[PDB]
Amino acid sequence: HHHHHHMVHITLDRNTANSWLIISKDRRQVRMGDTHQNVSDNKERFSNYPMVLGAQRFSSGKMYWEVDVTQKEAWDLGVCRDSVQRKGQFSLSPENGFWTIWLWQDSYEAGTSPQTTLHIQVPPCQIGIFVDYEAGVVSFYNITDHGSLIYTFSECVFAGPLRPFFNVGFNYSGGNAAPLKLCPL
């Protein structure tokens, strides 16, 4: 792809994080802690899942960023509306304000309703995410496989400002402790 020139510097918003997440000093990495991280509760925190938002809000234009997922067994990545539900159980779908893909149990899927199987021959170590606000497009790229296309959501109805979205996943297995990292431009 040729989207690299729309690169934006994303940082994580601590205030939105699930209370078990540990965000690095530079706000560019996040991982699952083994306990509550001793923060107060607030209405912005995702309560049920190990999720966090980027600080940046997008309402126009073209945006691109990259995320490192090396050695993880489970994660979700994409964008979401600023006004998505934070508390309780919910599914990741465009109806609920999410445009995402995930890894789970050795398969990759797009967060449509119902979910869509992805066809990935080279497991990615870094994911590129492209958003075209005006066109209503969110696309995902396999940086490990020369930028090959993973998935395109088109005809998106964003219906609000967008924020970068992250889920580091649970670590019930002991094999999913590795962080999500925002990669340098």
Residues that bind ligand W1A (CB under 6 A): 20, 32, 34, 170-172
Q: What does the block give as tokens for 7?
A: 């690169």
When the beta carbons of 29 and 144 are compared against ligand W1A, the nearer one is 29
For residue 14, the minimal CB distance to ligand W1A (Å) is 17
Q: Which residue is nearest to ligand W1A (CB)?
A: 170
When the beta carbons of 142 and 171 are compared against ligand W1A, the nearer one is 171
For residue 6, the minimal CB distance to ligand W1A (Å) is 34
For residue 172, the minimal CB distance to ligand W1A (Å) is 5
Q: Which H or E element spans position 67?
A: strand 62-68
For residue 54, the minimal CB distance to ligand W1A (Å) is 22
Length of the chain: 185
CA distances from 14 to 22, 30, 59, 167 (A): 9, 10, 22, 14
For residue 48, the minimal CB distance to ligand W1A (Å) is 8
Bridge partners, 75 (sequence order): 103
How far is Cα 100 from Cα 109, in angstroms, rounded to an integer? 9
When the beta carbons of 10 and 32 are compared against ligand W1A, the nearer one is 32
| SS3 at position 143 | helix
Task: Choose among 105, 111, 49, 39: nearest CA to 80.
Answer: 111
When the beta carbons of 32 and 63 are compared against ligand W1A, the nearer one is 32
Pair 30, 22: CB distance under 8 Å: yes
When the beta carbons of 38 and 121 are compared against ligand W1A, the nearer one is 38
